[PDB]
Amino acid sequence: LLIGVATSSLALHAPSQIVAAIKSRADQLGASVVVSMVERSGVEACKAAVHNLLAQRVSGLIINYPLDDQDAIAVEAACTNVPALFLDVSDQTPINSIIFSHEDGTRLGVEHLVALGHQQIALLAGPLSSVSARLRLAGWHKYLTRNQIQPIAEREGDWSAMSGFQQTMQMLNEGIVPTAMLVANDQMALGAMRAITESGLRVGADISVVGYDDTEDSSCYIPPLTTIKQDFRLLGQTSVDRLLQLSQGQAVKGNQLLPVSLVKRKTTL
Amino acid sequence: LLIGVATSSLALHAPSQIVAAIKSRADQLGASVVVSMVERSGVEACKAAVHNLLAQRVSGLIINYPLDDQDAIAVEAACTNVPALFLDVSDQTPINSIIFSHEDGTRLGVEHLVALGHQQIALLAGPLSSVSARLRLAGWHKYLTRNQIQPIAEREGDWSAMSGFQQTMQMLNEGIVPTAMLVANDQMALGAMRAITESGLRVGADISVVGYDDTEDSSCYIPPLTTIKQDFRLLGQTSVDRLLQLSQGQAVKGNQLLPVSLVKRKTTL
Ligand SMILES: CC(C)S[C@@H]1O[C@H](CO)[C@H](O)[C@H](O)[C@H]1O
Ligand SMILES: CC(C)S[C@@H]1O[C@H](CO)[C@H](O)[C@H](O)[C@H]1O
C-alpha cells in the first residue's frame, strides 16, 4: 500500500500520464504512490532514485525509466528484495517487466505507410541511449526491410517537441523530403509537424507523420496526429495490480507485453 | 533535505514542468524530492497528500494544488511544524506562497489585444474550481472593463487541449465569432487553435490567440503560440530556496509575487 515510482523526466508527457495512470489504479485499491524523478540519464541516476524511494519505505517499486539490459539488472539488484517492476526495458531482460509491444507498434506504423503507398520514409528516433528508442528504431528497420524499403533519412531527437523541430528542419535543409515520417513519440511529431508546415508543406498531403504514444494533446495537434496508441491507463492498472501480486508473492515473474494500436487521424494520407 | 511536493495532476504540462523545476534546483543543492499526486479535487484530497508526505517525514512542503482561501488555510494548518509553500493560491491568503502575478498576466494579454485593435474578445477560462483560473478570469474582466470592453463570449475548459477544442468549436457553431481569444493555458490554446483552423479560419489573422504559461510545446504549436510566459524554472528555484531558508528559521513569511511576461510569437496580429 505504498508504491514508489521512479520515473524519467516528467517534462515528457508519456511519463506524466503513466504516473497519473499508476496513481489512479493505486487510488482504486487504497494504495499510496510516491514519485521520485530520475536525474537525467544513467544507471547511477536511476539507482539514486530507487534509494530515495526505499528511503520512504515503499513496499513496491515501479521503475519507468529506460534501462539497458545490464543496467536494468544492476537496478533490480539494488531494489534488494522489495518488489520491482520495470516499464522501460527490452522484453529480453530477465527481470519483472511490463512493456508495450514494439514489434506491433513499429509494424503498424510501417505497414500503414506502406499501405498508403509511401516509399520515401524518414525515421525520427528517440535518443538512442534509451532502450525503448532503440527497440522502436530496430522495429522500423525490421518492417521496412521486410517491405524492401530503406529509409531516406534517420535522425535522432531527445523526445521533446523542439528536437523534432530541429531534426526535421535539418533533414529538410539537407534536401531530404520524405513523403512520410515515422516518429518515435508524439512530442517530437509535434515539432516535426511544425518543421513541415513552416517549410511550406502540408502535413499529410506533402509529408505524412506517424507519432508514437497517443499522448493526450495528440488529438488536437494541427492536424490531429495519426499515431501508435500505447494505453498508459492500461499500463498503470496493469503494473499496479502486478506489483501488488508481487508483494503477495504469487505473481507472474518475467516480462509481459501489452498490445498497442494505430490511431488513424489526419496527418497520414 | 527532503522536499515533499503535493501536486495537482501531472498529466497537465505546467505541474510537470514545475515538478521538474523543483527537482532541478534541489539537485543543485543536494536535496531529495518526493512527489505525491493529488487525487481528484478539493482540500480533503490535498490534506491526504500532505499527510502522505508528512508520514514520509519530509522536511519541507511545496503544495502545487489549487486552493481557495479557507481550504489553503486548512491545508497549511495540516502541515504541522513542517515548512510549507503554496504555489496555486491567491496572494490574499495569509500563508507562505509564491505565485505568478495574475494582475500582470491578464493585463498583458488584454492590453496586447486591445493594442492590436481587437474589440471582439472571447475568454477561455480554466476550470473555475481552480483559484488560479478564477484569478485569471477576474483579471481579464478587470482589464477589459477598464478598457470599457465586454467579452463577446466566455467559456470554461478543464485545462486540456480537447476542452479548448470543444469550447471553441461550440462557440463558433453558435455563430459567436471573436477576432481574438484569451485562453487560460497553452494546452487549451492548442485546442482553440485546432478549432479555429478546422473552422476554415487563420489563427493570427482571423482569430488571434493568447495562451498562458509558455509550457514547453508551445513554441512548436502551429503557428507558434503567443502566450503569457510563467517561468516555472524561476518558480522551482525560488520555491526550493525559500523552503530551505524557512527550514532553518530565517525566511520571508507571506506571499511573493513572481513576474510574468508576454512572449509574442505568431498567433496574434
Ligand atoms: C514506458 C516508456 C517506454 S514510454 C516513452 O517514455 C519516454 C521517456 O523515457 C518518452 O516519453 C516517449 O515519448 C515514450 O514513448
Ligand atoms: C502554479 C499553477 C497555478 S500553474 C497552472 O496549473 C494548472 C493546473 O493546476 C494548469 O496546468 C495551468 O495551465 C497552469 O497555468
Are the beta carbons of A137 and A184 closer than 8 angstroms? Answer: yes
Q: Mark out the alpha helices in chain A (DSSP H runs).
A: 13-29, 43-54, 69-78, 102-116, 131-146, 161-173, 186-198, 232-247
| Closest approach atom of ligand 1 to CA A87 | 1
Give CA–CA dist A224/A226, Å, rounded. 7
CA atoms within 13 A on the CB side of A4: 29
CB spacing of B52 vs A36 below 8 angstroms: no
**Count of C-beta atoms within a 10 Å radius of residue A78:** 17
Are the beta carbons of A255 and A98 closer than 8 angstroms? Answer: yes
Are the beta carbons of B95 and B69 closer than 8 angstroms? Answer: no
Are the beta carbons of A98 and A138 closer than 8 angstroms? Answer: no
CA distances, B27 to each of A38, B4, B247 (Å): 10, 14, 17
Question: Which amino acid belongs to residue B105?
Answer: G
- Around ligand 2, the residues with Cβ closer than 6 Å are B 8, 12, 14-15, 64, 66, 87-88, 130, 132, 159, 185, 212-213
Give CA–CA dist B243/B98, Å, rounded. 11
Give CA–CA dist A160/A165, Å, rounded. 9
Coil, strand or helix: which one is A89?
Answer: coil
Of the bound ligands, which one is closest to the alpha carbon of residue A127?
1
Q: Which residues contact B253 (CB under 8 A, 6 or more apart)?
A: B96
DSSP for B178-205, please give it.
-SEEEESSHHHHHHHHHHHHHTT--BTT
Q: Which of A91, A88, A163 is nearest to A133 (CA)?
A: A88
Instruction: Among A88, A97, A99, say which to mutate for ligand 1: greatest number of ligand atoms within 8 Å of CB.
Output: A88
How far, rounded to the nearest angstrom, does the alpha carbon of residue A148 sit from its chain's CA centroid?
Answer: 26
Any ligand 1 atom below 6 A from CB of A158 = no
Q: Which of B40, B82, B38, B37 is nearest to B58 (CA)?
A: B82
- Asked if B52 reaches chain A (Cβ–Cβ under 8 Å), the answer is yes
Residue of A nearest to B45 (CA): A27
CB spacing of A216 vs B161 below 8 angstroms: yes
Å from CA of A15 to ligand 1 middle: 6
How is residue B39 written as a grid cell? 487525487
Give CA–CA dist B74/B47, Å, rounded. 8
Domain boundaries in chain B?
Answer: 1-100+230-259, 101-229+260-269
What CATH class does A101-229+260-269 carry? Answer: alpha beta
Q: Which residues contact B138 (CB under 8 A, 6 or more apart)?
A: B102, B106
Q: Nearest-CA distance from A148 to chain B in Å?
A: 34
Å from CA of A222 to ligand 1 middle: 22
Any ligand 1 atom below 6 A from CB of A163 = no
Are the beta carbons of B267 and B186 closer than 8 angstroms? Answer: no
Q: Which residues contact A44 (CB under 8 A, 6 or more apart)?
A: none
Residue of B nearest to A195 (CA): B220
* A125 backbone dihedrals φ, ψ, rounded to 5°: -75, 160
* Partners of B255 in the β-ladder: B97
Any ligand 1 atom below 6 A from CB of A165 = no
Omega prior to A259 cis, within 30 of 0? no
How is residue A169 written as a grid cell? 528542419
* B16 backbone dihedrals φ, ψ, rounded to 5°: -65, -50
Q: State the residue for C-alpha cell 489549487.
A: B66
The residue contributing the CA closest to ligand 2 atom 5 is B14
- Asked if B34 reaches chain A (Cβ–Cβ under 8 Å), the answer is yes
Are the beta carbons of B214 and B182 closer than 8 angstroms? Answer: no
Coil, strand or helix: which one is A262?
Answer: strand
* A259 backbone dihedrals φ, ψ, rounded to 5°: -75, 170
How is residue B18 written as a grid cell? 514545475
Q: Which of B244, B212, B263, B224 is nearest to B100 (CA)?
A: B212
Q: Which of A265, A237, A266, A241 is nearest to A251 (CA)?
A: A241
Q: How far apart are the first and last CA of chain A?
A: 48
CB spacing of B190 vs A9 below 8 angstroms: no
CA distances, B113 to each of A195, B180, B268 (Å): 27, 7, 8
CA distances, B240 to each of A153, B22, B28, B48, B90 (Å): 44, 6, 10, 22, 19
Q: In this structure, which topology does domain B1-100+230-259 adopt according to CATH?
A: Rossmann fold (3.40.50)
CB contacts of A190 in chain B (<8 Å) are: 217, 220-221
Give CA–CA dist A103/A100, Å, rounded. 9
* A80 backbone dihedrals φ, ψ, rounded to 5°: 25, 75
Give CA–CA dist A168/A176, Å, rounded. 9
Report DSSP state, residue B228.
E
CB contacts of A36 in chain B (<8 Å) are: 32-35
CA distances, B56 to each of A1, A4, A120, B50, B137 (Å): 14, 12, 54, 10, 37
DSSP for A47-68, please give it.
HHHHHHHHTTT-SEEEEES---
Q: State the residue for C-alpha cell 512530442.
A: A187
Q: Which of A139, A13, A30 is nearest to A64 (CA)?
A: A13
Of the bound ligands, which one is closest to the alpha carbon of residue A13?
1
Instruction: Among B17, B185, B257, B263, say which to mutate for ligand 2: greatest number of ligand atoms within 8 Å of CB.
Output: B185
* Bridge pairing between strands A2-7 and A60-64: parallel
Q: Mark out the alpha helices in chain B (DSSP H runs).
A: 13-29, 43-55, 69-77, 102-115, 131-146, 161-173, 186-198, 232-248
Q: Nearest-CA distance from A6 to chain B in Å?
A: 10
How is residue A143 written as a grid cell? 518492417
Dihedral (CA of B256, B25, B10, B42) sign = negative
* Bridge pairing between strands A84-86 and A60-64: parallel
Give CA–CA dist B87/A193, Å, rounded. 34
* A193 backbone dihedrals φ, ψ, rounded to 5°: -55, -40
Any ligand 1 atom below 6 A from CB of A90 = no
- Asked if A85 reaches chain B (Cβ–Cβ under 8 Å), the answer is no
Are the beta carbons of B60 and B26 closer than 8 angstroms? Answer: no
Q: Which residues contact B158 (CB under 8 A, 6 or more apart)?
A: B126, B127
How is residue B58 written as a grid cell? 519530509
A132-168: b or e for each residue (b if 16 or more CB lie within 10 Å)? bbbbbbebbbebbeeeebebebbbbbbbbbbbbbbbb
Q: One fold for both B1-100+230-259 and B101-229+260-269?
A: yes
Coil, strand or helix: which one is A85?
Answer: strand
CA distances, A2 to each of A30, A186, A244, B153 (Å): 9, 31, 10, 46
Q: Nearest-CA distance from B98 to chain A in Å?
A: 21
Instruction: Write down how long chain B is.
Output: 269
How is residue A18 written as a grid cell? 503513466
Give CA–CA dist A210/A264, Å, rounded. 9
Q: Give the dihedral of Cα atoms B168, B173, B177, B183; nearest 10 deg.
A: -10
* Partners of B37 in the β-ladder: B7
